[PDB]
Design a protein around this ligand. Structure first.
Ligand SMILES: *[C@@H]1O[C@H](CO)[C@@H](O[C@@H]2O[C@H](CO)[C@@H](O)[C@H](O)[C@H]2NC(C)=O)[C@H](O)[C@H]1NC(C)=O
Ligand SMILES: *[C@@H]1O[C@H](CO)[C@@H](O[C@@H]2O[C@H](CO)[C@@H](O)[C@H](O)[C@H]2NC(C)=O)[C@H](O)[C@H]1NC(C)=O
Ligand SMILES: *[C@@H]1O[C@H](CO)[C@@H](O[C@@H]2O[C@H](CO)[C@@H](O)[C@H](O)[C@H]2NC(C)=O)[C@H](O)[C@H]1NC(C)=O
Ligand SMILES: *[C@@H]1O[C@H](CO)[C@@H](O[C@@H]2O[C@H](CO)[C@@H](O)[C@H](O)[C@H]2NC(C)=O)[C@H](O)[C@H]1NC(C)=O
Ligand SMILES: *[C@@H]1O[C@H](CO)[C@@H](O[C@@H]2O[C@H](CO)[C@@H](O)[C@H](O)[C@H]2NC(C)=O)[C@H](O)[C@H]1NC(C)=O
Ligand SMILES: *[C@@H]1O[C@H](CO)[C@@H](O[C@@H]2O[C@H](CO)[C@@H](O)[C@H](O)[C@H]2NC(C)=O)[C@H](O)[C@H]1NC(C)=O
Ligand SMILES: *[C@@H]1O[C@H](CO)[C@@H](O)[C@H](O)[C@H]1NC(C)=O
Ligand SMILES: *[C@@H]1O[C@H](CO)[C@@H](O)[C@H](O)[C@H]1NC(C)=O
Ligand SMILES: *[C@@H]1O[C@H](CO)[C@@H](O)[C@H](O)[C@H]1NC(C)=O
Ligand SMILES: *[C@@H]1O[C@H](CO)[C@@H](O)[C@H](O)[C@H]1NC(C)=O
Ligand SMILES: *[C@@H]1O[C@H](CO)[C@@H](O)[C@H](O)[C@H]1NC(C)=O
Ligand SMILES: *[C@@H]1O[C@H](CO)[C@@H](O)[C@H](O)[C@H]1NC(C)=O
Lengths: 366, 244
């Protein structure tokens, strides 16, 4: 190394600096507050009864942490068509509001609930925009809605004069007029009822079977985002140079116990030039302490390649505790200048030959 | 539900020196025995604050609200722009056991009072509340010099508070007391005006000791001192004197 840095095949007696040395981080850790205030997804996906499609039930979700993974991995969903984003990455990005629209439809009509789709349900009871971002879940509910005598409580607007804009609920009970024959809110020549009921029965074939549907739409208005997925935290280690992510404040170093005393509202401390020196962990609320893990230059002591061929090594300003082929080598000694390997200390005293520092120096005898 | 009155109360809006009050911790960092210079919104030293003994006052940037209260006559505050059904509004109250914060866009009437009965059950501050979004409950905020700083930046409403045992008769004390962060709220409103909520005995309204002080914040540079324990003990305003 000395030959390479010095760009020569011969080297004279002296001390030269070749390179640097620094402890590498072992692993990474992340800490975050306790997970709490979960969004109340239970009362929607486990509601006793659902609303009909023409009066589809809309709920607002904000100011809570939402876990979609439990829904995503759940195998009780016969249909999980999730368009706006990739569901796996859904736990990462987050928004300012969520809208959950719940209702009950027939099995075949499920495919109508998608961007750029048309049909009775897709145009007369609930409409999705072409640019819709969100995620649709549907599951069979035969054992609940179907009745042996036929359930008729669920209704849908079969007839309507005009189509529906996206997210446009209309509960108007106008007697639809097919022709030009006027009706004073009564039936007649060309007058019918816009809303017709379902006839759900246990023996109805699949696709003619009731399916409960929930659509999640994500709203990202300029107001601060309050709905975000949970943050996974890990265990914390000590006395090892690692890289950490304490509540978004990231950095490398070794963590020790500290005797400082924060006021009950600080989170972390710094001293001068704005360098962080202590953090309070969100889960234990005890003050830790940060110290950069050791680094420093290395130097080679040689008596001149003409005389001999063996050298000694000095690590500058490094405690002789974490040195690491030259991990043990020869007798190891510790000085105010650093740690010195390959040389042996004596209790004599001669004129300084190769100045090492702090009042000590080395020479060749070995 | 509210009615007008013949005894049209008005307040002696006198003026008073600000002295060196209205200092709060600007962030969450801990510093020990050091002098730190920060540029932020403060209440300038030795300014003039308006002393009252209910108008609608501008919010501007932020406000500093102080009360040499006894028995906690004051109740709450209302913030917004138009204070009607059309525009979103904010309300804060503290009746007897908890602070209640709402971001409900309800509309008020001419006289926003609470009223008590002598087992108290009386609340007719507003009438109708159609749409709204947010709610919050916490521990109550409140001889007793209470100081509060209300700020609203970047869609966040910040409240700092402090309480002191006062012994001087009427003027603000010539002491030092930094204000600690009390709460933060993530709500986007365009607050520009506000008012104040009052509690009166009803059985005969008795609301005469409405003595408090109001001041306004401006951007400037301050120099703060932190002792060993990391608390603020003294501060220096910068654009006040050549010596400063
Ligand atoms: C809706 O209810 C079902 C069944 O009640 C939940 O599925 C399981 O529910 C039992 C309790 O009855 C839990 O012990 C299981 O852990 C649930 N399975 C899971 C979570 O995979 C279902 O979780 C409920 N859904 C919501 C959103 O609350
Ligand atoms: C966060 O969760 C941790 C883990 O349960 C809580 O720490 C526990 O606190 C109770 C006291 O309420 C102790 O009896 C347990 O021994 C603690 N467990 C551990 C692993 O430390 C903690 O209280 C929760 N809250 C906060 C704010 O951290
Ligand atoms: C190099 O590191 C070792 C180990 O950390 C230091 O030895 C420690 O010394 C302190 C005070 O002298 C004791 O309280 C510890 O118990 C010691 N630890 C061990 C494991 O023995 C040593 O002092 C360091 N060298 C220098 C020059 O500071
Ligand atoms: C102050 O006002 C709050 C808000 O109304 C009251 O909180 C209610 O308390 C009752 C009974 O304690 C609960 O059933 C309600 O759910 C609480 N919230 C609401 C919105 O009503 C509080 O009780 C009031 N303080 C006193 C002393 O009456
Ligand atoms: C609650 O908010 C909704 C949506 O903002 C209001 O419904 C319509 O909102 C648009 C947008 O401002 C207005 O142009 C319409 O006139 C509103 N419809 C009606 C019938 O007023 C709604 O008015 C608000 N209030 C209530 C009580 O729902
Ligand atoms: C700083 O914090 C300490 C710790 O609570 C306060 O208490 C003092 O602690 C020291 C020991 O470090 C004692 O010698 C004092 O007698 C304690 N004083 C009191 C009033 O208990 C201390 O008061 C705080 N302030 C200062 C300026 O040190
Ligand atoms: C090495 O040292 C010997 C002994 O003095 C000398 O004879 C020789 O010339 C030296 N060689 C070099 C390259 O310095
Ligand atoms: C040198 O002296 C020290 C005491 O100062 C002693 O501990 C050591 O054994 C002696 N010998 C060597 C080789 O260091
Ligand atoms: C009338 O109002 C003033 C100011 O609020 C008050 O001091 C006075 O006691 C009131 N008088 C009556 C009879 O209410
Ligand atoms: C505050 O205003 C009053 C009247 O507006 C004035 O008399 C007083 O001197 C002012 N205080 C100052 C300028 O510090
Ligand atoms: C009033 O001041 C006393 C100190 O004299 C304090 O203990 C009390 O908490 C204060 N009250 C309020 C509501 O802050
Ligand atoms: C309210 O503030 C927002 C934030 O910039 C702004 O876009 C909007 O125009 C404001 N509305 C008003 C002032 O009525």
């Amino acid at each position: 190394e000395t030959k390479c840095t010095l760009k020569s095949f011969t080297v004279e007696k002296g001390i030269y600096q070749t390179s640097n040395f620094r402890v590498q981080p072992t692993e990474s850790i992340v800490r975050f507050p306790n997970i709490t205030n979960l969004c109340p997804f239970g009362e929607v996906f486990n509601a006793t009864r659902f609303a009909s499609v023409y009066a589809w039930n809309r709920k607002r979700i904000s100011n809570c942490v939402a876990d979609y993974s439990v829904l995503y991995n759940s195998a009780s969903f016969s249909t999980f068509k999730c368009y706006g984003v990739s569901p796996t990455k859904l736990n990462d990005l987050c928004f300012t509001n969520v809208y959950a629209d719940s209702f009950v439809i027939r099995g075949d009509e499920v495919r109508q609930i998608a961007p750029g789709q048309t049909g009775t349900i897709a145009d007369y009871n609930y409409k999705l925009p072409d640019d819709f971002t969100g995620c649709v879940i549907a599951w069979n509910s035969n054992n609940l809605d179907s009745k042996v005598g036929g359930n008729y409580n669920y209704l849908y607007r079969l007839f309507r004069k005009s189509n529906l804009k996206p997210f446009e609920r209309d509960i108007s009970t106008e007697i639809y007029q097919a022709g030009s024959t006027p009706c004073n809110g009564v039936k007649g020549f060309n007058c019918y009822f816009p809303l017709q009921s379902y006839g759900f029965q246990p023996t109805y074939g699949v696709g003619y079977q009731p399916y409960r549907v929930v659509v999640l739409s994500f709203e990202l208005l300029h107001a601060p985002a309050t709905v975000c997925g949970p943050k996974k935290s890990t265990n914390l280690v000590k006395n090892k140079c690692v890289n950490f992510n304490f509540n978004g404040l990231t950095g490398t170093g070794v963590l020790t116990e500290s005797n400082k005393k924060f006021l009950p509202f600080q989170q972390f401390g710094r001293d001068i030039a704005d360098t962080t020196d202590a953090v309070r962990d969100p889960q234990t609320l005890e003050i830790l302490d940060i110290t950069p893990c050791s680094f420093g230059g290395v130097s080679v002591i040689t008596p001149g390649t003409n005389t001999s061929n063996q050298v000694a090594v000095l690590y500058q300003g490094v405690n002789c505790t974490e040195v690491p082929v030259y991990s043990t080598g020869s007798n190891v000694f510790q000085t105010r200048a650093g740690c010195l390997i390959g040389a042996e200390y004596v209790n004599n005293s001669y004129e300084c030959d190769i100045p090492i520092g702090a009042g000590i120096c080395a020479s060749y005898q070995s | 539900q509210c009615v007008n009155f013949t005894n049209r109360t008005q307040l002696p809006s006198a003026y008073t020196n600000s002295f060196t009050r209205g200092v709060y911790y600007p962030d969450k960092v801990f510093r020990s025995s050091v002098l730190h210079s920060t540029q932020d919104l403060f209440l300038p030293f030795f300014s003039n604050v308006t002393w009252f003994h209910n108008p609608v006052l501008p919010f501007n940037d932020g406000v500093y609200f102080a009360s040499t209260e006894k028995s906690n006559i004051i109740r709450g505050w209302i913030f917004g722009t138009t204070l009607d059904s059309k525009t979103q509004s904010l309300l804060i109250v503290n009746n007897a056991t908890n602070v209640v914060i709402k971001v409900c866009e309800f509309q008020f009437c001419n006289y926003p009072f609470l009223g008590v009965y002598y087992m108290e059950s009386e609340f007719r501050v507003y009438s109708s509340a159609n749409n709204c979004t947010f709610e919050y409950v916490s521990q109550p905020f409140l001889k007793n010099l209470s100081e509060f700083v209300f700020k609203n930046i970047d869609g966040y409403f910040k409240i700092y508070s402090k309480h002191t045992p006062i012994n001087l008769v009427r003027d603000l004390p010539q002491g030092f007391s930094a204000l600690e962060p009390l709460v933060d709220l993530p709500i986007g409103i365009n607050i520009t005006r506000f008012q104040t909520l009052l509690a009166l005995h009803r059985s005969g309204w008795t609301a005469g000791a409405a003595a408090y002080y109001v001041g306004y914040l401006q951007p400037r540079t301050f120099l703060l001192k932190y002792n060993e324990n990391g608390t603020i003990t003294d501060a220096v305003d910068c654009a006040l004197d050549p010596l400063s």
